[PDB]
Design a binder for this molecule. Sequence first.
Ligand SMILES: Cc1cc(CCCCCOc2ccc(C3=NCCO3)cc2)on1
Lengths: 255, 40, 40, 236, 236, 59, 273
Amino acid sequence: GYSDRVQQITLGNSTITTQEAANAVVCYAEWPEYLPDVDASDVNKTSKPDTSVCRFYTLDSKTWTTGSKGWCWKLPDALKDMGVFGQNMFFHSLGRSGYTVHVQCNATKFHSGCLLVVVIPEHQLASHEGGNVSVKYTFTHPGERGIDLSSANEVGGPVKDVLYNMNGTLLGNLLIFPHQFINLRTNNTATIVIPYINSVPIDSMTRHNNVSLMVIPIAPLTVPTGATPSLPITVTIAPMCTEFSGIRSKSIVPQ
Amino acid sequence: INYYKDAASTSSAGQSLSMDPSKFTEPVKDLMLKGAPALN
Amino acid sequence: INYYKDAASTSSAGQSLSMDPSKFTEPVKDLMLKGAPALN
Amino acid sequence: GLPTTTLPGSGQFLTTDDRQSPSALPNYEPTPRIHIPGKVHNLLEIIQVDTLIPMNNTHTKDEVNSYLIPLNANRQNEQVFGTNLFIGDGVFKTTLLGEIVQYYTHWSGSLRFSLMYTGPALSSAKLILAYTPPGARGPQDRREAMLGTHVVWDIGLQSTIVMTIPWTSGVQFRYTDPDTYTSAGFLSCWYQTSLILPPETTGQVYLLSFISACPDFKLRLMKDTQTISQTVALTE
Amino acid sequence: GLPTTTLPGSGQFLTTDDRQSPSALPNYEPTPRIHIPGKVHNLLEIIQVDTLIPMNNTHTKDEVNSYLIPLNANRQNEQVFGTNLFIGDGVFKTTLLGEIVQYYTHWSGSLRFSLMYTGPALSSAKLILAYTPPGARGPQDRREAMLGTHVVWDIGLQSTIVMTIPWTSGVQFRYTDPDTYTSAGFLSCWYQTSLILPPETTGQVYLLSFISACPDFKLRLMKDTQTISQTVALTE
Amino acid sequence: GPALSSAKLILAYTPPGARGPQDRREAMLGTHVVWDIGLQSTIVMTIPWTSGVQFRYTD
Amino acid sequence: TVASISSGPKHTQKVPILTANETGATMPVLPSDSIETRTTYMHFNGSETDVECFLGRAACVHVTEIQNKDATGIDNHREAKLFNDWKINLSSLVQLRKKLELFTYVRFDSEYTILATASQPDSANYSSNLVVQAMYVPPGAPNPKEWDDYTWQSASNPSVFFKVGDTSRFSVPYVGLASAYNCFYDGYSHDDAETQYGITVLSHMGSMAFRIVNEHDEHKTLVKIRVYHRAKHVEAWIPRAPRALPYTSIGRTNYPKNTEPVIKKRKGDIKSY
Ligand SMILES: Cc1cc(CCCCCOc2ccc(C3=NCCO3)cc2)on1
């Protein structure tokens, strides 16, 4: 009586149940694991807070309306302030982590709409100015708020044009990245497990984000007659196999 | 025959002949069998 | 393959892979053990 | 001194030849490799992942909406969409498949075309997708369409339908840049019965459509893509 | 006559290639080697010998005094010295380590920083040395400093203290010429308790400081040093 | 609720030492379960024994 | 290898063509799951789509130019193209660039070919064979200032001397600092508020510098350098969506404003063929 459909994920002191899942994606078919010695470089023993950092943090909720263009969060940024995960983050020189991402959106059998939930490794954004204008730090570190693709261009911020993925590629091809759809008629959640993907064994958690999670409405939300025209979307994310190394004074970052 | 000492100096590599699209085409956690229902 | 008769005409030598810094880093007459006191 | 003779071609530089060269950095030791998920070995590995087709091309500036094929409730017998199968041009051209095919001169193989339905769960519909092999015109009505490769799709719990365009061909390779002799057919879709919405519901519903290549597929003779060009060198 | 084809690069002179050449002096017999103490095989052998760092760089013309870090009796909580760790520049630059690092583009490894105390034997002191890994600012007070790599040094019979800056890094190599992304941290030193001089004694005492590389160390991709140049050829 | 409705609730247990949470952000950092309302009508949350002292007073 | 097996009529409870794309998988459906097929063999291996093959041919990565002329009274050799350099990079010319950016991280050895041809714009006499010197100047090396500085001694820095009209060729191991080169980098060099964003911060591989060794003749001679790059021993990870809009800068993803629709509009209906 197991269905692909019902699932439970327990991680730390927190549990999620979905009764309307559509399997789960594990990026590149690899599950998060700690850093092996053969791959290690820094000689420091690392710190593995385990259950105090590897639990589920639910970010603040978004509201899908008929005019929504899509939202974008960066990792580990989105979690920069969650509990002890965040403290560890500002206090060590280097850290590394994988995540379980669970995006939630329920409706009824009269609604229609379909969101794309995708994880993009190394999502370098484009400046809407063109040329070689850079995208300032603050703009690519929105924190739990994430970036709202239907917000206005700002100065020093990225471009927010959806048919171009914020980088000069077409929305249609985002499907080459680990992703899952939430089609109100099928699905009510999306779950993706992200292994740590980098060109170095461990890195800085503040100067470099290693994935952007993106939720994009593709088939517009259509509510039943005289229904309220909107649904909330909630994102809950859990660091998994986290390791921190090179402890010290506590980083100070712009803004 | 390599005439040179360093590995960078050798010619192109030879075909992976690796080929396994499943990391890209089927990264699902619970295995899906073709023919069985997608969602049970 | 050497094409030439004299030794000077051969290519560069190949790595010493000798490496022993102690003549420079520890030329002391009575051996010092790390962890034992320097001056007894 | 060993006697030699040099042949025609001596001194030429062929950008495609593969030979040994002296290393400028004798004895240098590269950084160790660490493990990174995701290694690609063949472009054939990636063109099997499906991506969305902007089938609804009828707009005037690129929009998320050209990915949506609309469906109308209560129409009978009528046609949902049509396209030829020049995978290197037209709707296909910006898709990952289209985009890679363009790096090669010839392609052969089967294509997989699927449609995922997004209408309310309490609605229902039966569509027919038809592949018309080279030699006939794009079908003009379902009767015409239904006499070639087709699948009656019944919209249900299982949200997507995967149609295969089996390789139908005299010549074993076709050109990726559209060519007549080498042309592959048409793909059309019609209401088999009709879309029906539940009460309290209204308007258009949309289908999303994807394209990817079957394991069947072959691409050969690499060349340059018409999809990218430039007028002056870029700088930092 | 055997048929050949010559490739691109024929006739070039690459200063780094290693091939055979005819000897101009056929059959000449070199002088026998005799034994000489001191043979060097690797530059890695010599960068492990420690040499003095002109830490006290604050003078205006080079002087023996910039090798001396002064210490003041009776100060509490305060800071003895500070420096970043760009081994290819600044204090490090003229040291043997600094001087060799400059022949290579990349370095990786642990550094050994030691301090030898020279104050009267009847004095006493406790200092803290702190290494701050990349990512934070140079510490501004001991509280800040003590939260990173540190050693409380107790001045005693044993005159020197050897602090190691363990390799703390994401990227496995850093640039020897100062670069941000690639930067290595800061090194600071503060009074842990304070220097105390015996009676009949007065003034400043000094610490000498050395730097050498741990056996850990790697240097790669040789290049030319900014440390030497010229405007006309020399003559006899 | 009617069978054709849907809902997702979070239940949170806050162990001794902090105040009753004032908003979900605060609540979600302690023991919690996201409940998805479905066919399966009930959700069972456990308040695991979190305690220094091995017994508490009932009063 | 069979490309298609033989398959006949089906009337089952086992439907391989109905799936749920919401899952993120592309189910491996074949012609034989939905029509009746006959056996056929592949006759093909997929050799020429190997990434080593795809990135393994020489591409032009840079065209520069230097001139041989009397430097007498020139206050800025660099500025007179008495010698010139190049801030090495592989993203400046954009044909090879789109190919590499199909991947996120890439690792390979490089084989460079340098073609140098001469031009004599101002009506001339006898051209004495010019010899070009290409020398690699890595980060933190005395950058050269005149066309005949001590720098050109290049006692520790690899340099090649070849003749104009000829070609020079040599190969450099993978010089990246990490395990792979980042084709993309969503980071900064540090957490400052105004520091550049991108890879340019990551990819400072130093510059290459060219000059003519010859002193000047009576006329002036323009020498134009073309650098070709061939990847050998390629390794690529994490495929990405291909580049759709035009490029504007080395190292940023930025596209131009008021660009044109990249998807071709139908001449007709959705229903059109
Ligand atoms: C990404 C990415 C990859 C690359 C290429 C890096 C190549 C390493 C440095 O390139 C050279 C170039 C020229 C020489 C040279 N030595 C003597 C003459 O030319 C040496 C290394 O650039 N960006």
